[PDB]
Design a binder for this molecule. Structure first.
Ligand SMILES: [Mg+2]
Ligand SMILES: [Zn+2]
Lengths: 70, 69, 51, 502, 1340
């Protein structure tokens, strides 16, 4: 008893973090043209995030838009 | 769905256990409904042998005595 | 208390009932009296059963 | 009339001088839910009782410890009967006075009426049919019920003060029903999944593990013994170590014939511990099954195969021996736990400063607009989330094998014998997951929201936590308790709907 | 260092200095009540406050006014002790001065006469104890402080789940302190609605019409005006250069001889910069833009005088022409923009069924009370009473403050009710948030949760007490004759005293004090609840409010909360927390000015705290008090991060201030998983007080604060020396400095001796000082139960060792050595109260006579001639405590009984046996008997002996006071007579009573002798009256209930040892139920032979991540080590030198701590007494987050000469051989909780049965059998257990006929059942058949 309550918490925490973690993937490699609007992707985003397809401008914008509807 | 499936039961005594009791009896009293027991819930209600397990022997042996001569 | 479906009437005990330990001994008091009156003389039984 | 029949389908006639509305005929049948009388609970019931439960490892699996005081009051009509049957009482009214007087003569009578008379033990939320089980009663001085430890799994009983109820099978039918259907030993397999539910729990498995385990070099190294009988002789007298590599003559059996027992004798390469253990295992099992290390996992598959090969009877008495022995050697082992058992990795502070600089990289990039704001959150959360996997599998490499010890020649390393490891590796309690919060850092926590916080708990339990770290740990902890409090109501409702439809 | 510190000093680890010592822990309860009952010559909350609101009361305009003067509190009818035994409530009579004035008819006002009626009595109001409890019926109760939503206005969401569109919604709520709710809410269509209370939703604009606002003023108020000019022919428009933002051009928009923008180009920053800078006031337009515009005011035709267009009517290209040809130059229109200023209020008007003032006032009246007709006088009055009456509505000051606060006003106080402006301004602000400017509140933030406590809640219950008497007073003042009735005739007592008795008696917030433990009491009085009146409900909210909120830091404990159906719905008050002036929760901090940390402290409410940047508790500052590092971990606006040295505005006071008193009592808390910590401070309060008050070897430092601040201990009023020490009382001869000038004398503390608690535990005080010892003010004078030497000792620590012991600790079960039960040390003393009642039944009166039918002298030995058990008689189960008989005549016995009576000659009595007998299984010593007798029934024999003995004891007690107080007072007279006439030997020869005569030469010493005389004769007379009243109270008729003649209460002292079944646990959430009690022969011992007391399971420690219990065990081990060292040296009698050298080394340890110590203590007489108190072990202190660290523990293990491992080798006491591996041994403070087995254990063969349902029922405490509910039936259904089930709900319970048929069969030795039908179902058939339903049993 009670021990299970702790157990429950750990499983939940792990799952939430994991989803978040995945949303970054891993060893990617590609081009530099933004898929939304073609703006220049700097090699900084290429080397920070392996497989980036959204310019910094679009990597805000969309994030921003989602927030607004919340 | 399980909740909907269970809602339909042959024994009216069983229904007045878990369904809304006022409605069950009213709906059932006008119909002149006859409950033959047969099920588990109702036999527990009326306090006789469960028609399964050890009692299955008895209920089976007695159910056949019915509709007979 | 508790607001629970525990109601006053659910605690009112029955006082007219006869508890088995007494219903037991009464069934057994007849037994003893009966055997005591047969182990007597047949006249003393009819005499005592009558008084 | 309407207020009499079903009050409430009007304006709600109230009772005299009393604000509350008066309960009508319809309100006398209806309830929550339906007829109160058939709803839990459920009707109180004569011949019953309860108290706190305690242990009693000395029990056979088919019995239980029942207080003298309770058994006296419970079987009262039986005692009154057997007392006047054998002639010790003139009449029932005398028998009443005798057991009331607690005359010593009665105790010897009670033991007669108790013998082949099962009682029913039932613990709090009755979830499966194993929630009620029938035991043979053993008289106890004390006011607690003694509950055989292997049944604790089925009841989901721990001993934090839980109480159980007793029920006396009155009628002759109820005794034979309780003996052939509800008896402990008749229900050792879960009806949900054919696997044994009477698996050895925790103390008892940690026992066998330490026993059938080997270290590189200890007393008894390499000698050879006539059979299991003299392997114990070697150990009990302190000549051999429990865990030392040893060839001994063993005789295993295999009923591989047409239902017929074949015997095989061999000089098996084993340890003293595993030798002694074979003395329990019944006939037709192979010596291979006890030749391993025996964790909680391997220990239950053993019980399973015993059932599916020899049958109910041999498995039951076997399962008793497993418990008895595991407890005994667990005590001999002297396993314990002190502060120095929870070994932190030597690299911890390093791993932090590295992933701490990783946030300093992604920070520089955020301020300079290389990466966006929501991006940076999910970036930092990964470089912390990684370091925790590094700290976890660092200590676990250190903790697992780093007992480095030597045999006659140079150096060698093996699975650790550190106390807290043996517990997890065996399966007695705790897992590398929970261990990760004792030695390594304990994760990142998240507030009830779910949005995991961007500065993890960098400290662990062997160290202190500080003000903030504990306060962050709070949220996850409280919602944990809060959740499982409601998760009690939810289980109950699902199973209820299912039996209504079945 | 003090006096009861010099006795025994706890070695304190922990580096951070205490800057503010823990205030009175009962501050909250005592403070609040003191405010309620007190003369306040102004409005601040109190009884004065409540009065001033309702008063003055005036008759129905008859100019007969009753005004309120002032009030007094009579002395308590019984004092604390007195009121408890008898069973009265501890209350004082409330006497309030009232003035009745009458105005002539007809009067320019002024009075014919006014009678100034003295203080009419309106009930007694309960009083709070010295220690923060109430007495309601001789039973101590606590009033739990409550947490509810602050009054004011709060804008909330209801995002997401609403409608499954997302969108979100926004609603405003005006929540006043008293009066109806005012709710404003939107919907998806963006229509504003209002609902009073939780009632029927209604279109929002209706309230404006109720305030006498017509359609024109609603447009004017909530909208701007777009002025349309007809200049020349067809339409110009006033253009605000800003209006066009968030819209696209509607036409060819041109002005100033230049086309700025053509049709179809959205008006942005370019166009608005042009218009504003070029000053475009007027532009020419087409007649079609007003096709959508809404006309503002009313415009009528000047000729025909008819209505052209009503206000809030949309124009059309044809509608303009009708009011253009009539000569109307202006047409005012609405500015409608769905991003900035939305056309919201416009749409609402179109949904309103009303039009004028009385039109709306009706729709409000018909909504509130449907079904009955509206009236002109009714509808107008109703609305004015809702939000505008001083009587039926009030926000209070706090409500007005948060109201003004949330609305960005300046005034912090203003109207107490809502105004036409107030309501409008709120509707205004609500709209702003929907527009995107502004954010919503959350219920959870502790700046929007307010704390009420006893003082306030009683005020409110008194206010309602008057409003139901006010109707009555107004009613009498209508018809009241001239100068005959006076302000007492009208005001009844019961109506006032009932409205207040209602609260303290039964309320979710008035409960039996959780009193098994000084921690239990103190943790209860500091408690919060969001449940009950005016708060949330368990079924309502809703996880957000249960969860721990960031604002809880330092106000509410994060860890101490119940573990049940209301988690987070209770919480416990943090240590240093205090209630804001406005009634919010604030906490202490330290003012960081620039880069220095000051010691001037500030209390910051939840709202105040958010703004500032607060440093952390554990922060290193040195020298002047600069921050050591250039960056320090701090928390500011809801989050926590690293901060610059000089940006921090404040800093945490203590490392402790985040937890509760319960939570702070856990040592090495930092090392304990938060969940288990909760269980720890949850179970700590369940610790039953022990026989011998131990002391925690492993402590935290708080134990002294909890012991003292909880009443259980006896704390010195004034410093001085002890004159007399008795196990009964303690007399303190006061020092001169603290001693008052007159009455002189001594402080005399009468001790509480063995007595029943609320939970049947025993609460007993013992003297902790010896004859003639120096004590200073605020010293510990006597220990309560579970307190030692001034420290809080909820249990007894013992030698504990972690290892499997043959399975006798399988789950969390505990294995205990016999040495513990032999040492009677977890033995626990309980006091039950059993009472006997002589009633009146229809057949006759019950007698308490000792003549009991068919009982032998064996019984009547323990009973006196009167029929009451003697004091002091050790009795067990079955012995009769009070003989009693009830009238039951003519039994009508049967033949065989008759024959039996004739054979053995028993005079079959006409009286039943009803005597009070001892419950089976429980056994103890009688320590007290009370008899309460009806006024006017003759006190029997024993009753008269008692009330005679109470008299002799009371006379001895009072005189003892006078004897000590005289001698104490005469002793001062002797010393002042010596100052200017000292005749040392001459003076004390003559009789001391013959001293008062000696005078003194011209000086104040002549006036000083005069002072002691006054207070002597007052002791002489105050003695007399104190003795007189005492005597009357004993003989006076004890008043009882109807039907009851006299009552005997017997008090038992059962001494329960400890046996398998008892729940025990350490402070770290490690529960366990003692499983077997082992012989000392079988215990694990070490090479020195000393067995170990408890054998715990190592498996319980890793899973439940409570690692502090191990640190406790190790430190405890080292703490006993220092003990074992001193015990040897003290037995060696080494001498002060060798001893003091060793003690000094312990209290430093490594360097950097906060402790400080000797050699100041007087190097002999004082130092030796300490050594003694330490030989049992050296008390150490691990503060909560300032705790000891492994190194300090290992270092203290070195000094104790014990291994650093914390582990040793052990030997099995049975086989004698070694245990492989080292095992940990040490000392862990452990509690025995009061789930003691021989309270839980019940059994029943055949017992009582309920009347209504022939069903096993608890009646004589041979309790009802176990309930066999639905789930237990499915159990039997899953087996084949068909018969086991039938018997379970037939003969074993419900079958009135079957149960006896069975029992008879059982004793005949035939196991069968002849079942038949359960009466439960038999009643259903009749219950159904008594409805119109023919329910039969068919066939055969
Ligand atoms: Mg439990
Ligand atoms: Zn882009």
């Amino acid at each position: 008893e009670a021990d299970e309550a702790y157990s429950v918490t750990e499983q939940l925490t792990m799952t939430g973090i994991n989803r978040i973690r995945q949303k970054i993937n891993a060893h990617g490699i590609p081009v530099y043209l933004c898929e939304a609007c073609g703006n220049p992707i700097p090699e900084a985003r290429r080397k920070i995030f392996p497989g980036v397809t959204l310019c910094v401008e679009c990597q805000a914008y969309q994030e921003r838009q989602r927030k607004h509807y919340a | 769905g399980i909740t909907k499936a269970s809602l339909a039961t042959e024994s009216f005594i069983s229904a007045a256990s878990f369904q809304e009791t006022t409605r069950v009896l009213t709906e059932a009293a006008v119909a002149g409904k006859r409950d033959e027991l047969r099920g588990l819930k109702e036999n527990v209600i009326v306090g006789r042998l469960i028609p399964a397990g050890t009692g299955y022997a008895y209920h089976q042996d007695r159910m056949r005595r019915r509709a007979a001569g | 208390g508790d607001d629970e479906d525990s109601h006053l009437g659910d605690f009112i005990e029955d006082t007219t009932l006869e508890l088995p330990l007494d219903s037991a001994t009464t069934e057994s008091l007849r037994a003893a009296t009966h055997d005591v009156l047969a182990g007597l003389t047949a006249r003393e039984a009819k005499v005592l059963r009558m008084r | 009339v309407d207020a009499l029949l079903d009050n409430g389908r009007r304006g709600r006639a109230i009772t005299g001088s009393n604000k509350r509305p008066l309960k009508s005929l319809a309100d006398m049948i209806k309830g929550k839910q339906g007829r109160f009388r058939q709803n839990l609970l459920g009707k109180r019931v004569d011949y019953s009782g309860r108290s706190v439960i305690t242990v009693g490892p000395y029990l056979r699996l088919h019995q239980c410890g029942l207080p003298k005081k309770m058994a006296l009051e419970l079987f009262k009509p039986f005692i009154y009967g057997k007392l006047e049957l054998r002639g010790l009482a003139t009449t029932i009214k005398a028998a009443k006075k005798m057991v009331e007087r607690e005359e010593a003569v009665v105790w010897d009578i009670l033991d007669e009426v108790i013998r082949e008379h099962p009682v029913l033990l039932n613990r709090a939320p009755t979830l499966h049919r194993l929630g009620i089980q029938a035991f043979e009663p053993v008289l106890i001085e004390g006011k607690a019920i003694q509950l055989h430890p292997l049944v604790c799994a089925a009841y989901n009983a721990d001993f934090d003060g839980d109480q159980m109820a007793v029920h006396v099978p009155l009628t002759l039918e109820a005794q034979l029903e309780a003996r052939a259907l509800m008896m402990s030993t008749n229900n050792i397999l879960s009806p949900a999944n054919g696997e044994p539910i009477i698996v050895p729990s925790q103390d008892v498995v940690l026992g066998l593990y330490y026993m059938t385990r080997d270290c590189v070099n200890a007393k008894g190294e390499g000698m050879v013994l006539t059979g299991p009988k003299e392997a114990e002789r070697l150990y009990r007298s302190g000549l051999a170590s429990l865990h030392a590599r040893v060839k001994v003559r063993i005789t295993e059996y295999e009923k591989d014939a047409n239902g017929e027992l074949v015997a095989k004798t061999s000089l098996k390469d084993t340890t003293v511990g595993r030798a002694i253990l074979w003395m329990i295992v019944p006939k037709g099992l192979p010596y291979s099954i006890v030749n391993q290390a025996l964790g909680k996992k391997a220990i239950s598959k053993m019980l399973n195969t015993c059932y599916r090969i020899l049958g109910l009877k041999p498995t039951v008495i076997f399962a008793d021996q497993i418990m008895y022995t595991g407890f005994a050697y667990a005590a001999r082992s002297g396993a314990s736990v002190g502060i120095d058992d929870m070994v932190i990795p030597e690299k911890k502070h390093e791993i932090i400063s590295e992933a701490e600089a990783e946030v300093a990289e992604i920070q520089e990039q955020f301020q300079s607009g290389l990466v966006t704001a929501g991006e940076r959150y999910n970036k930092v959360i990964d470089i912390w989330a990684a370091a925790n996997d590094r700290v976890s599998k660092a200590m676990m490499d250190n903790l697992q094998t780093e007992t480095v010890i030597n045999r006659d020649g140079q150096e060698e390393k093996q699975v650790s014998f550190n106390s807290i490891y043996m517990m997890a590796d065996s399966g007695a309690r705790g897992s590398a997951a929970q261990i990760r919060q004792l030695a390594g850092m304990r994760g990142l926590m998240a507030k009830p929201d779910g949005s995991i916080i961007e500065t993890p708990i960098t400290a662990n339990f062997r160290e202190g936590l500080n003000v903030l770290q504990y306060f962050i740990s709070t949220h996850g902890a409280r919602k944990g308790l809060a959740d499982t409090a409601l998760k009690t109501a939810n289980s109950g409702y699902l199973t209820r709907r299912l039996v209504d439809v079945a | 260092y003090s006096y009861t510190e010099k006795k025994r000093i706890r070695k304190d680890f922990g580096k951070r200095p205490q800057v503010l010592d823990v205030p009175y822990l009962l501050s909250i309860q005592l403070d609040s009540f003191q405010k309620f009952i007190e003369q306040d010559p102004e409005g601040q909350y109190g009884l004065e406050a409540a009065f001033r609101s309702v008063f003055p009361i005036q008759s129905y305009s008859g100019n007969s006014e009753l005004q309120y003067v002032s009030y007094r509190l009579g002395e308590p009818v019984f004092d604390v002790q007195e009121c408890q035994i008898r069973g009265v409530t501890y209350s004082a009579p409330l006497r309030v001065k009232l003035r009745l004035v009458i105005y002539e008819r007809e009067a320019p006002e002024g009075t014919v006469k006014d009678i100034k009626e003295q203080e009419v009595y309106m009930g007694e109001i309960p009083l709070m104890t010295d220690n923060g409890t109430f007495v309601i019926n001789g039973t101590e109760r606590v009033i739990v402080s409550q947490l509810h939503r602050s009054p004011g206005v709060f804008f909330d969401s209801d995002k997401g789940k609403t409608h499954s569109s997302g969108k979100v919604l926004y609603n405003a709520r005006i929540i006043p302190y008293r009066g109806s709710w005012l709710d404003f809410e939107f919907d998806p269509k963006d229509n504003l609605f209002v609902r009073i209370d939780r009632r029927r939703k209604l279109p929002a604009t209706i309230i404006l019409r109720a305030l006498n606002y017509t359609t024109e003023q609603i447009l004017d108020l909530f909208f701007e005006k777009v002025i349309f000019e007809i200049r020349d022919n067809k339409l110009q428009m006033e253009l605000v250069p800003e209006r066009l933002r968030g819209e696209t051009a509607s036409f060819d928009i041109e002005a100033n001889g230049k086309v700025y923008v053509e049709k179809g180009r959205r008006i942005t920053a370019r166009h608005i910069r042009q218009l504003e800078k070029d000053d475009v006031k007027l532009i020419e337009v087409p007649v079609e833009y007003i096709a959508g515009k809404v006309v503002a005011k009313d415009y009528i035709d000047e000729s025909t005088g008819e209505l052209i267009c009503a206000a809030n009517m949309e124009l059309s290209l044809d509608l303009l022409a009708k009011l253009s040809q009539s000569g109307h130059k202006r047409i005012e229109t609405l500015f409608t923009n769905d991003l900035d200023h939305g056309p919201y209020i416009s749409e609402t008007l179109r949904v309103d069924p009303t039009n004028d003032r009385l039109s709306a006032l009706v729709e409000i009246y018909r909504m509130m009370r449907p079904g009955e007709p509206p009236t002109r006088e009714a509808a107008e009055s109703l609305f004015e009473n809702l939000f505008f009456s001083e009587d039926r509505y009030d926000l209070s000051a706090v409500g007005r403050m948060k109201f003004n606060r949330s609305l960005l006003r300046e005034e912090i106080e203003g109207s107490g009710i809502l105004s036409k402006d107030d309501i409008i301004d709120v509707m205004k602000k609500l709209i702003d948030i929907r527009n995107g400017k502004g954010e919503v509140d959350d219920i959870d933030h502790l700046g929007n949760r307010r704390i009420r406590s006893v003082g306030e809640m009683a005020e409110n219950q008194f206010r309602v007490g008057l409003v139901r008497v006010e109707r009555a007073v107004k009613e009498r003042l209508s018809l009241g004759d001239l100068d005959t009735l006076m302000p007492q005739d009208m005001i009844n007592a019961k109506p006032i005293s009932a409205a207040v008795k209602e609260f303290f008696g039964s309320s979710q917030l008035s409960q039996f004090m959780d009193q098994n433990n000084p921690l239990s009491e103190i943790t209860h009085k500091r408690r919060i609840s969001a449940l009950g009146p005016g708060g949330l409900t368990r079924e309502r909210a809703g996880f957000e409010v249960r969860d721990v909120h960031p604002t809880h830091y330092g106000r509410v404990c994060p860890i101490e909360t119940p573990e049940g159906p209301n988690i987070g719905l209770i919480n416990s008050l943090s240590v240093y927390a205090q209630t804001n002036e406005y009634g919010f929760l604030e906490t202490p901090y330290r003012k960081v000015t620039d880069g220095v940390v000051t010691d001037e402290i500030h209390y910051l409410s939840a709202i105040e705290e958010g703004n500032y940047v607060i440093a952390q508790a554990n922060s290193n500052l040195d020298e002047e008090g600069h921050f050591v590092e250039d960056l320090v971990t701090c928390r500011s606006k809801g989050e926590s991060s690293l901060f610059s040295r000089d940006q921090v505005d404040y800093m945490d006071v203590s490392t402790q201030q985040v937890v509760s008193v319960g939570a702070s009592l856990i040592p090495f808390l930092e090392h304990d998983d938060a969940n288990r910590a909760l269980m720890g401070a949850n179970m700590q309060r369940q610790a039953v007080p022990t026989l011998r008050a131990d002391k925690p070897l492993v402590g935290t430092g708080m134990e002294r604060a909890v012991a003292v601040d909880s009443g259980v201990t006896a704390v010195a009023k004034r410093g001085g020396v002890v004159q007399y020490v008795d196990a009964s009382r303690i007399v303190i001869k006061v020092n001169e400095d603290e001693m008052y000038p007159g009455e002189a004398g001594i402080d005399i503390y009468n001790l509480t001796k063995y007595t029943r608690s609320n939970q049947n535990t025993c609460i007993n005080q013992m003297p902790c000082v010896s004859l003639g010892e120096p004590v200073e003010r605020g010293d510990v004078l006597a220990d309560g139960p579970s307190t030692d030497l001034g420290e809080l000792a909820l249990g007894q620590n013992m030698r504990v060792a972690f290892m499997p012991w043959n399975g006798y600790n399988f789950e969390d079960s505990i294995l205990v050595s016999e040495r513990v039960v032999q040492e009677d040390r977890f033995t626990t003393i309980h006091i039950q109260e059993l009472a006997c009642v002589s009633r009146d039944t229809k057949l006759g009166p019950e007698e308490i006579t000792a003549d009991i039918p068919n009982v032998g002298e064996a019984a009547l030995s323990k009973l006196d001639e009167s029929g009451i058990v003697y004091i002091g008689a050790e009795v067990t189960g079955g012995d009769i405590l009070v003989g009693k008989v009830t009238p039951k005549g003519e039994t009508q016995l049967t033949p065989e009984e008759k024959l039996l009576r004739a054979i053995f000659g028993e005079k079959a009595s006409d009286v039943k046996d009803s005597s009070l007998r001892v419950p089976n299984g429980v056994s103890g010593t009688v320590i007290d008997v009370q008899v309460f007798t009806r006024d006017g029934v003759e006190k029997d024999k024993r009753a008269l002996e008692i009330e005679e003995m109470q008299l002799k004891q009371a006379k001895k007690d009072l005189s003892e006071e006078l004897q000590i107080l005289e001698a104490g007072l005469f002793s001062r007279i002797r010393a002042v007579l010596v100052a200017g006439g000292v005749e040392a030997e001459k003076l004390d020869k003559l009789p001391r009573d013959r001293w008062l005569e000696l005078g003194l030469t011209d000086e104040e010493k002549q006036n000083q002798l005069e002072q002691l005389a006054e207070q002597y004769d007052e002791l002489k007379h105050e003695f007399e009256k104190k003795l007189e009243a005492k005597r009357r109270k004993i003989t006076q008729g004890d008043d009882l209930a109807p039907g009851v003649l006299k009552i005997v209460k017997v008090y038992l002292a059962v001494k329960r040892r400890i046996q398998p079944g008892d729940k025990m646990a350490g402070r770290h959430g490690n529960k366990g139920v003692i499983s077997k009690i082992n012989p000392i022969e079988d215990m694990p011992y070490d090479e020195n032979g000393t067995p170990v007391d408890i054998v715990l399971n190592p498996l319980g420690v890793p899973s439940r991540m409570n690692i502090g219990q191990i640190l406790e065990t190790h430190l405890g081990m080292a703490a006993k080590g220092i003990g074992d060292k001193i015990n040897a040296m003290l037995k060696q009698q080494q001498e002060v030198a060798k001893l003091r050298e060793f003690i000094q080394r312990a209290y430093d340890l490594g360097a950097d701590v906060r402790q400080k110590v000797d050699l100041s203590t007087f190097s002999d007489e004082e130092v030796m007494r300490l050594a003694e108190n330490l030989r049992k072990g050296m008390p150490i202190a691990t503060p909560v987050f300032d705790g000891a660290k492994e190194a300090e523990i290992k270092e203290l293990l070195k000094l104790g000469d014990l291994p650093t491992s914390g582990q040793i080798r052990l030997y099995d006491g049975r086989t004698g051989e070694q245990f492989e591996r080292p095992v940990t041994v040490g000392y862990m403070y452990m509690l025995k909780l009061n789930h003691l087995v021989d309270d839980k254990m019940h059994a029943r063969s055949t017992g009582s049965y309920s009347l209504v349902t022939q069903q096993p029922l608890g009646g004589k405490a041979q309790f009802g059998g176990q309930r066999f509910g639905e789930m237990e039936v499915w159990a039997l259904e899953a087996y084949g257990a068909a018969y086991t089930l039938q018997e379970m709900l037939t003969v074993k319970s419900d079958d009135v006929n079957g149960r006896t048929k069975m029992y008879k069969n059982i004793v005949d030795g035939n196991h069968q059942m002849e079942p038949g039908m359960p009466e439960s179902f038999n009643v259903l058939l009749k219950e159904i058949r008594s409805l119109g339903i023919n329910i039969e049993l068919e066939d055969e």
